[PDB]
Amino acid sequence: SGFRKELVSRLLHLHFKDDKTKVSGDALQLMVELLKVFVVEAAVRGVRQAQAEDALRVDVDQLEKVLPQLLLDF
Template sequence: MSGPSRWRFNPVVLDRDPPALELVSKLLHLHFRDEKTKVGGDALQLMAELLRIFVVEAAVRGVRQAQAEDVTLVDIDQLEKVLPQLLLDF
């Protein structure tokens, strides 16, 4: 990789973003069998941070794959190529 990277990430701090925490909470509750299941605040923040790291890592790996293929735009093809290893790593 030569020269400065043109890819910049501005990660959202999810524990200070109530709409993001609400979204993570709703996503979790979609998969609970018992609708009375509750998620504590610490668990919700931890899950939000895990999802943030997962998405950032997917983006970084997609960029690296695009650079290896000498393309300037990351699209679904690059993400599909990095997804199997990413899922194994998480």
């Protein structure tokens, strides 16, 4: 289905360096949108490089190969 409100209500607030800075519910659901599509695009990029190697399984090595671009534009 997707990321939940209780999930991103704690995950994003873990790393915040100030205790008084929060994320609103309408913005929290957009964090849901972008973190869901984060897995979605990471998965489709991995599937696409697997298709470039014409493979049925995606492994750790191709993910490490795309990281220099995965963290780069996405």
